[PDB]
Tab-separated table of C-alpha atoms and ligand atoms in Angstrom:
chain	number	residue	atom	x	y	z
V	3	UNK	CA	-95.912	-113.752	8.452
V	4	UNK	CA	-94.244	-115.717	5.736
V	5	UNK	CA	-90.609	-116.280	6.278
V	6	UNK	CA	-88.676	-112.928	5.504
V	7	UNK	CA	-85.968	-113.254	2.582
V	8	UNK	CA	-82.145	-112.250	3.669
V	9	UNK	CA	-81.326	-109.296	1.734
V	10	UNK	CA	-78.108	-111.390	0.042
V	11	UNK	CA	-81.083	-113.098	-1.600
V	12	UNK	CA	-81.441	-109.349	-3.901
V	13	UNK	CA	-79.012	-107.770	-6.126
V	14	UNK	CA	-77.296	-105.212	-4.497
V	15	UNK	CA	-77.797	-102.604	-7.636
V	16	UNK	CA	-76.834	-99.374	-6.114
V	17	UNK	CA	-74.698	-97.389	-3.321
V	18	UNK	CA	-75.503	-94.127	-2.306
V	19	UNK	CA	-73.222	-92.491	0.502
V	20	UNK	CA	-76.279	-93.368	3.682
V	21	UNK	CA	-78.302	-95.481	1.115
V	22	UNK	CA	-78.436	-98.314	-0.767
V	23	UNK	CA	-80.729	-100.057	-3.594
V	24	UNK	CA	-81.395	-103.466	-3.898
V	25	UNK	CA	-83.204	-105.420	-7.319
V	26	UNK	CA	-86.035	-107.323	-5.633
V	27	UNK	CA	-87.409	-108.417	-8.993
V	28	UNK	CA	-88.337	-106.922	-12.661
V	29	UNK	CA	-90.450	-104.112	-11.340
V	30	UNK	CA	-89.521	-103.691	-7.592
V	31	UNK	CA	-86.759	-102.339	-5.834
V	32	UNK	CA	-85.641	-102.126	-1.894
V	33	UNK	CA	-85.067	-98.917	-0.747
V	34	UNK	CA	-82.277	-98.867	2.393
V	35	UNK	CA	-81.887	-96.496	4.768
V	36	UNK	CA	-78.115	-96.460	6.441
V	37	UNK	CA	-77.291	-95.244	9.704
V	38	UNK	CA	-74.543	-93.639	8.325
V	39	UNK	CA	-74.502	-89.681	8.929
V	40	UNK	CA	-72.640	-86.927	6.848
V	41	UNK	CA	-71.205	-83.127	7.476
V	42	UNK	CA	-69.088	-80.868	5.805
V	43	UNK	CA	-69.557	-83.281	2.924
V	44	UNK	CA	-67.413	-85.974	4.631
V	45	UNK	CA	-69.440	-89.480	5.694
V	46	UNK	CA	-68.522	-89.686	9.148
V	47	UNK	CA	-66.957	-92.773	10.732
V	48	UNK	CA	-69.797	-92.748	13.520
V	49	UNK	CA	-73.228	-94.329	12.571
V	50	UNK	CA	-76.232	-92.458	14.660
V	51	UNK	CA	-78.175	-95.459	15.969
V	52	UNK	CA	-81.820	-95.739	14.678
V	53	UNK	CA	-80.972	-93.240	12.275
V	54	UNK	CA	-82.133	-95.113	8.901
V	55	UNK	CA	-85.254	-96.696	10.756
V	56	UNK	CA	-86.109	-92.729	12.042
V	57	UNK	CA	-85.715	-91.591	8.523
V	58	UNK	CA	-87.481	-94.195	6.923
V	59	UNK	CA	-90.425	-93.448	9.100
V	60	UNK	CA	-90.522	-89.731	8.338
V	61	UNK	CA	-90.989	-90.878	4.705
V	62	UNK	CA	-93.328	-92.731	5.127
V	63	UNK	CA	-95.285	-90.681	7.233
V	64	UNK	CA	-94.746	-87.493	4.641
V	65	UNK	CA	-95.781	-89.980	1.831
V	66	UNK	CA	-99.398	-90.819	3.320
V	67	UNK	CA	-99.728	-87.036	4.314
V	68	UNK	CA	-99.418	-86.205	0.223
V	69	UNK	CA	-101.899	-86.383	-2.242
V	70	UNK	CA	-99.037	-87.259	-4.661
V	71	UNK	CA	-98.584	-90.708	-6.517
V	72	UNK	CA	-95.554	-92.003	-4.757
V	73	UNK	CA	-93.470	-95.310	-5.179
V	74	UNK	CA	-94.161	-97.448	-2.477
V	75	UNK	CA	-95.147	-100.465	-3.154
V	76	UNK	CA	-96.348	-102.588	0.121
V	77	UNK	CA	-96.552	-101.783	3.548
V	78	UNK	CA	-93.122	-101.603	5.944
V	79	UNK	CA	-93.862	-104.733	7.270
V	80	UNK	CA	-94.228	-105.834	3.802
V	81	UNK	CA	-92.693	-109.824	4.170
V	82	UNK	CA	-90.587	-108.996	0.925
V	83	UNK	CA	-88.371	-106.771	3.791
V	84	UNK	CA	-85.160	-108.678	5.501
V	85	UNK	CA	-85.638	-109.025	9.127
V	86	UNK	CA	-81.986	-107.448	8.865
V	87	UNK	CA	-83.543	-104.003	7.614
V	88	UNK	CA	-86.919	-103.567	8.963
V	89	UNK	CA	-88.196	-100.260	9.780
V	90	UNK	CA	-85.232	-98.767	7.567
V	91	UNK	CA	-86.142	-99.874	3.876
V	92	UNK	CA	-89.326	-100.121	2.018
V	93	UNK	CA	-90.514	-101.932	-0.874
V	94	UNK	CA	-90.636	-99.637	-3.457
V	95	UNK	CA	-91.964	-99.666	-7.893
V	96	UNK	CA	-89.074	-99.494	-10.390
V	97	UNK	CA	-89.977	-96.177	-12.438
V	98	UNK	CA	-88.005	-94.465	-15.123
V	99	UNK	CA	-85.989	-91.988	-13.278
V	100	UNK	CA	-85.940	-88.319	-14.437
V	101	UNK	CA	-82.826	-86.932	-14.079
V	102	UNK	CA	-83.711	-83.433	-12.254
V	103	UNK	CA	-82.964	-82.755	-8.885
V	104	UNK	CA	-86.371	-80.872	-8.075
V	105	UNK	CA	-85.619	-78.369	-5.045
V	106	UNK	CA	-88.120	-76.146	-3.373
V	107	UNK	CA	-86.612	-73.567	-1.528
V	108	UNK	CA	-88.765	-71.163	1.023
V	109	UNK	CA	-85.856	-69.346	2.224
V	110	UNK	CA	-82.684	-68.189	1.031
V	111	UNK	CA	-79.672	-70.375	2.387
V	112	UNK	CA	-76.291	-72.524	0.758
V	113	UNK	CA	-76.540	-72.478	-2.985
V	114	UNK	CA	-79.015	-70.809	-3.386
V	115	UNK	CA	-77.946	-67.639	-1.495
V	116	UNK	CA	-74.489	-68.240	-2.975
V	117	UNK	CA	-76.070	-67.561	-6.048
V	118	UNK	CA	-78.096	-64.675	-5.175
V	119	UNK	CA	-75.210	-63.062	-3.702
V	120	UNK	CA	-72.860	-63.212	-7.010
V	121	UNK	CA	-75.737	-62.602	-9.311
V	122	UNK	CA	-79.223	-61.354	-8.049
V	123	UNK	CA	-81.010	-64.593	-9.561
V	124	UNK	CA	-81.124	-68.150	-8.475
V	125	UNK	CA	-82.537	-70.977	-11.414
V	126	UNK	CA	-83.170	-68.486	-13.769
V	127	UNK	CA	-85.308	-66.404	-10.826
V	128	UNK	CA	-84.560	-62.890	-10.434
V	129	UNK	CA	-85.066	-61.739	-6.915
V	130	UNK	CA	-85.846	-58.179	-5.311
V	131	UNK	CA	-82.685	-56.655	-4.129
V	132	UNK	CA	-81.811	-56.562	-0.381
V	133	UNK	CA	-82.228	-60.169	0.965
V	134	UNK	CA	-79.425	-62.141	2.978
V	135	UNK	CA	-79.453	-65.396	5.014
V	136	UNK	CA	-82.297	-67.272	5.717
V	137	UNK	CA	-84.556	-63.980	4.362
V	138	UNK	CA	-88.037	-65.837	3.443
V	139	UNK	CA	-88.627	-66.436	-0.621
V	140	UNK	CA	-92.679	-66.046	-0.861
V	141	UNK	CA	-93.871	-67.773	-2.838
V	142	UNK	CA	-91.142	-70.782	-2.568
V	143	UNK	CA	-88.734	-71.075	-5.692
V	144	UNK	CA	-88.074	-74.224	-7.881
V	145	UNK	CA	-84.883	-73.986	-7.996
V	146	UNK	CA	-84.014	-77.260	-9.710
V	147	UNK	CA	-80.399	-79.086	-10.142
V	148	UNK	CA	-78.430	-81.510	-11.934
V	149	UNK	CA	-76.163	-83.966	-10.209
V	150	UNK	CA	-72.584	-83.631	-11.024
V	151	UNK	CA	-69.086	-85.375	-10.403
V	152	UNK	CA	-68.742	-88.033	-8.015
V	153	UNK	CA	-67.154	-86.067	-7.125
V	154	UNK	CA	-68.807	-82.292	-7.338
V	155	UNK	CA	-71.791	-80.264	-5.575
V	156	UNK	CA	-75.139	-80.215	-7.634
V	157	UNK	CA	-75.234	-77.591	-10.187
V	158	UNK	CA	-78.141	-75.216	-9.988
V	159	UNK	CA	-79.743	-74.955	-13.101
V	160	UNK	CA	-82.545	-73.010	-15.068
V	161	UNK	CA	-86.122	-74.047	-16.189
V	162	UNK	CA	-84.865	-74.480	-20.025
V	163	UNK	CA	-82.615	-76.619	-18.750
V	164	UNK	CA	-85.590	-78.620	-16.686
V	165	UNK	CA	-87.239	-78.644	-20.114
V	166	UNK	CA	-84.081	-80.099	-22.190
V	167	UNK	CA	-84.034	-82.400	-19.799
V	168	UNK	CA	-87.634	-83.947	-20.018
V	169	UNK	CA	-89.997	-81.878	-22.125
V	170	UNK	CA	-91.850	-79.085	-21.617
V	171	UNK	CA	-94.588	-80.233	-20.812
V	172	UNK	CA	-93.485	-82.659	-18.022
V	173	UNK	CA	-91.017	-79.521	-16.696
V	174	UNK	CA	-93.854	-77.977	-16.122
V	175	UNK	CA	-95.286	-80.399	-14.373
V	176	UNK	CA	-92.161	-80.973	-12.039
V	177	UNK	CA	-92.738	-77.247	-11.292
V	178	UNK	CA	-95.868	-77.201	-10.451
V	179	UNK	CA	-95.787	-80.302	-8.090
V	180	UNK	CA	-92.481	-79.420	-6.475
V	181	UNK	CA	-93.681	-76.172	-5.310
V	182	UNK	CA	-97.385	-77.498	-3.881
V	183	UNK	CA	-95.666	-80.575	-2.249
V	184	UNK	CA	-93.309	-78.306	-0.647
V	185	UNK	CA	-95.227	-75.957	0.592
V	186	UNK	CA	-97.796	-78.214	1.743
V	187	UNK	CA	-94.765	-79.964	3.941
V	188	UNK	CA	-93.962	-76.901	4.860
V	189	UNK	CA	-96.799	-74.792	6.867
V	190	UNK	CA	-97.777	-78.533	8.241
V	191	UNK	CA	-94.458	-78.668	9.741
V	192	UNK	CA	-93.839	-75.377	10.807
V	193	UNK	CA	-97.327	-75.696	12.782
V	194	UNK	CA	-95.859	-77.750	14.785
V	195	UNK	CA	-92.882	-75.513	15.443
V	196	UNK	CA	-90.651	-76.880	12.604
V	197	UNK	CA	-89.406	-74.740	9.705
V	198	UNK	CA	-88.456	-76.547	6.604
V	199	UNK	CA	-86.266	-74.515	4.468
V	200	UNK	CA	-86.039	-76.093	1.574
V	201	UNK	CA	-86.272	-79.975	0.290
V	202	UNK	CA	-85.174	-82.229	-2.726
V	203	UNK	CA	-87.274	-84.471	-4.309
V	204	UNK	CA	-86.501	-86.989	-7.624
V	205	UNK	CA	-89.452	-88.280	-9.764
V	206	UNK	CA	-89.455	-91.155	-11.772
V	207	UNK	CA	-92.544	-91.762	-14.188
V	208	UNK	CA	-94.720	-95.208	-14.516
V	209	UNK	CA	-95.705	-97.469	-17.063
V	210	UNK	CA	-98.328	-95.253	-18.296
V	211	UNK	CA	-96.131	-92.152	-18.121
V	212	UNK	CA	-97.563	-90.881	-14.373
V	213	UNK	CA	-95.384	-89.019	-12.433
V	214	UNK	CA	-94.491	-90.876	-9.304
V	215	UNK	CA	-92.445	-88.768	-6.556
V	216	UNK	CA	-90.290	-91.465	-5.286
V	217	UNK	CA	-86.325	-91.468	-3.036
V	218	UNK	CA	-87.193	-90.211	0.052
V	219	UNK	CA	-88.934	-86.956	1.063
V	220	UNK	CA	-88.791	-84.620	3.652
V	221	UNK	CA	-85.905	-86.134	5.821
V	222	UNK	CA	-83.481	-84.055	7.440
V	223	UNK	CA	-80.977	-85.122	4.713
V	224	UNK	CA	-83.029	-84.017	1.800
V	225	UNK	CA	-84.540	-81.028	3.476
V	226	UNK	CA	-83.174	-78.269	5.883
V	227	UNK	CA	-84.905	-78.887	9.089
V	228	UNK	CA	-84.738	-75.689	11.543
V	229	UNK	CA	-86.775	-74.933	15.263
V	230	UNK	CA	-88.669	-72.381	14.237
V	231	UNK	CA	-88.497	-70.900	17.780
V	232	UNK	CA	-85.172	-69.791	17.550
V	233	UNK	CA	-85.676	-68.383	13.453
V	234	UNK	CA	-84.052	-64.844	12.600
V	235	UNK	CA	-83.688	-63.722	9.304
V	236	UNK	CA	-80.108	-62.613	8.620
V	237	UNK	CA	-78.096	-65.290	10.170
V	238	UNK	CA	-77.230	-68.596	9.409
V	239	UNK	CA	-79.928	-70.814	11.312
V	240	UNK	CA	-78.433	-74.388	13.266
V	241	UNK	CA	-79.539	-77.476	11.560
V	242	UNK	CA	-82.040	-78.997	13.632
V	243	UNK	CA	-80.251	-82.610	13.537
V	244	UNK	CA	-76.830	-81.734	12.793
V	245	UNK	CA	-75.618	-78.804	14.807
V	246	UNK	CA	-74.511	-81.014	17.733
V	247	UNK	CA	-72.599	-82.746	15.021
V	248	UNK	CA	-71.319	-80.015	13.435
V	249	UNK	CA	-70.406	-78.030	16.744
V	250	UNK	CA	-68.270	-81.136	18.090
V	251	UNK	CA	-65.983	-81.111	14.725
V	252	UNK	CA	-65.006	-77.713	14.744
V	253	UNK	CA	-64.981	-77.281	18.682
V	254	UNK	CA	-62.182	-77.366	20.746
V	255	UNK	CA	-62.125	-81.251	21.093
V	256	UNK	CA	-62.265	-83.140	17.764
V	257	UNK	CA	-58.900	-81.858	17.247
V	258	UNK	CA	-59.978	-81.499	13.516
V	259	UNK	CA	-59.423	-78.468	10.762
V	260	UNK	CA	-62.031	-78.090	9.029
V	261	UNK	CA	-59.984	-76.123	6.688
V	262	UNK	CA	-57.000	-79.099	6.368
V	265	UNK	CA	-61.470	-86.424	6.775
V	266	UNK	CA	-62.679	-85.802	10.329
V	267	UNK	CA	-62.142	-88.333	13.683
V	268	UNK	CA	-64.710	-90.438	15.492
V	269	UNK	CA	-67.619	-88.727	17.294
V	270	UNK	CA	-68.264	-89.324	21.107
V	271	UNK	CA	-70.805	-91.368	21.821
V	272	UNK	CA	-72.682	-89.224	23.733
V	273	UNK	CA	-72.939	-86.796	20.815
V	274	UNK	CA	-74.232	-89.435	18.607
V	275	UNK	CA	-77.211	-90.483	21.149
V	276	UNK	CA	-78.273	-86.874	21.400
V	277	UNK	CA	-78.051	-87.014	17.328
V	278	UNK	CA	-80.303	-89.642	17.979
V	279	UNK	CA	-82.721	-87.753	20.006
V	280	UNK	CA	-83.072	-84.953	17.794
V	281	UNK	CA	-83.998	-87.490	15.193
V	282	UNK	CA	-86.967	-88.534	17.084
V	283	UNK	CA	-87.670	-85.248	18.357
V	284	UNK	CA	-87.997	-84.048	15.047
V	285	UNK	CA	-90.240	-87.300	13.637
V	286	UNK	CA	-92.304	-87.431	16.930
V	287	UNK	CA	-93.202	-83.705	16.313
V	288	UNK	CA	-94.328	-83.565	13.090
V	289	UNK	CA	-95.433	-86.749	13.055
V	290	UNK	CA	-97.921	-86.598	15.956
V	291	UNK	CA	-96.566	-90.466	16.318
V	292	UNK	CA	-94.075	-92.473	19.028
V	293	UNK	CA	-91.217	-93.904	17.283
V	294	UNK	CA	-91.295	-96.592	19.807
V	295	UNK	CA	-94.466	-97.839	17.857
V	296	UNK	CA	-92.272	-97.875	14.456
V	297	UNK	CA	-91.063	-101.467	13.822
V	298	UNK	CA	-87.724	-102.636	14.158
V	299	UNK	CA	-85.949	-106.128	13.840
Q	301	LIG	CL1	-78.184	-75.593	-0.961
Q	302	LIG	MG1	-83.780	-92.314	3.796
């Protein structure tokens, strides 16, 4: 219960586009969740309320599930949290990051399709011929990346690549992990009714040269959340959070051309972005987000 620090007592040390890092000393970082929502790779001028708070809680929930090492470093109560962000940023290790964007990917969407589509192979794998949208990949592919412009998409790149990056050995490693993590998160989720298509993770490494999964994991932002009820292989399956989102921009009311930096969303679509948020965290959770702490 000690008396919670204001977060302009840390160094704001980095901006992401919904998240933000602070310096909390030599060896620990906070880790901010925004409310702050994007599509069509435009941050939208509407915040979805509870957002950050319902996407910190997924990670934290899929970070106890794991066996993994991960980089949390108190509880998210922790007193080192502002009052101002609790339940949407956790006190988290400073690692050395490695610069690979590790993706798992279960089914064939986006890129990764893309790819398959003008070449036969995605990351170096070369798949059997005759798969489209959303068509299952058994076992799941690594199918890392390197981030780009500030700019660009991720570039999809190769396992030599992984291991010019940061060794063999330790691309191995990111490999191996990746794919059990993922699928793992996967066939708990899609139990409970929940497909998850694909995910990124970044790893950083410790002290002692550990790999630590750390950023967040398996949020609807760094994975492709689907209802599993409605899956069909062969056409493009709604995001589970977004497609009320997505729908209202290039419906008849935004008034927006998708094709030619988009308006305001209603209100009312934001709550029910909102909903689906919980929805999603209550379900594969098994917990009540009105249990998850807030300020
Ligand atoms: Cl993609
Ligand atoms: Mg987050």
């Amino acid at each position: 219960g000690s008396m919670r620090p204001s977060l302009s007592d840390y160094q704001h040390v980095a901006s992401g586009k919904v998240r933000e890092l602070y310096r909390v000393d030599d060896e620990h970082l906070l880790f901010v969740a925004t409310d702050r929502i994007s599509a069509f790779d435009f941050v939208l001028d509407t915040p979805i309320p509870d957002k950050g708070r319902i996407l910190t809680a997924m990670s934290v929930f899929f970070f106890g599930l794991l066996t993994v090492p991960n980089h949390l470093a108190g509880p998210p109560d922790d007193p080192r949290i502002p009052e101002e962000v609790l339940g949407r940023a956790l006190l988290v290790r400073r690692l050395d990051m490695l610069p690979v964007e590790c993706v798992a990917r279960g089914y064939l969407t986006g890129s990764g399709l893309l790819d398959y589509q003008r070449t036969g192979a995605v990351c170096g794998h070369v798949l059997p011929q005759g798969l489209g949208e959303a068509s299952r990949l058994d076992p799941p592919l690594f199918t890392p990346a390197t981030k780009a412009d500030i700019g660009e998409h991720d570039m999809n790149v190769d396992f030599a690549a992984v291991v010019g990056l940061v060794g063999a050995v330790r691309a191995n490693q990111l490999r191996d992990e990746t794919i059990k993590i993922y699928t793992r998160a996967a066939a708990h989720a899609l139990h409970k009714g929940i497909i998850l298509a694909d995910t990124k993770f970044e790893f950083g490494v410790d002290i002692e040269g550990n790999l630590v999964l750390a950023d967040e994991v398996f949020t609807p932002d760094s994975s492709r959340y689907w209802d599993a009820a409605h899956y069909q292989p062969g056409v493009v399956q709604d995001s589970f959070d977004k497609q009320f989102v997505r729908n209202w921009l290039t419906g008849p009311e935004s008034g927006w051309d998708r094709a030619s930096p988009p308006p305001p969303l209603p209100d009312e679509v934001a709550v029910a972005t909102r909903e689906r948020y919980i929805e999603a965290y209550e379900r594969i959770s098994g917990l009540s987000f009105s249990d998850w702490i807030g300020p």
